[PDB]
Amino acid sequence: AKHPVPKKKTSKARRDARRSHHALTPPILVPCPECKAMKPPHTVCPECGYYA
């Protein structure tokens, strides 16, 4: 409301561009020694267990 104010309604094109790097990234997983289930690296897991 005060001093900081947008001068112009940002164009739909320019807006979408900003969200360029906005895209997510898929998580990383790996097959465990127990089940074939995909555990996240350096971790245990439910319905699988672990050792030591």
Partner 1 sequence: PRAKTGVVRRRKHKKILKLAKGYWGLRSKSRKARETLFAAGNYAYAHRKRRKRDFRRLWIVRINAACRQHGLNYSTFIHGLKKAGIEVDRKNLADLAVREPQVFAELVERAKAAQG
Partner 2 sequence: MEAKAIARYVRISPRKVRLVVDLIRGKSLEEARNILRYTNKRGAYFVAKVLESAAANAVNNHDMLEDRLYVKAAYVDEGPALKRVLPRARGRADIIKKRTSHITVILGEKHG
Q: Which is nearer to RNA, 6 or 33 (CB)?
A: 6
**Whole-angstrom distance, CA of residue 38 vs CA of residue 28:** 9
Site string for RNA, 23-52 (x = CB under 7 A): ------------------------------
Q: Which residues contact 33 (CB under 8 A, 6 or more apart)?
A: 51
**Whole-angstrom distance, CA of residue 35 vs CA of residue 43:** 14
Q: Which is nearer to RNA, 22 or 42 (CB)?
A: 22
Q: What is the binding site for partner 2 (CB under 8 A)?
A: 22-24, 26-27, 29, 38, 40
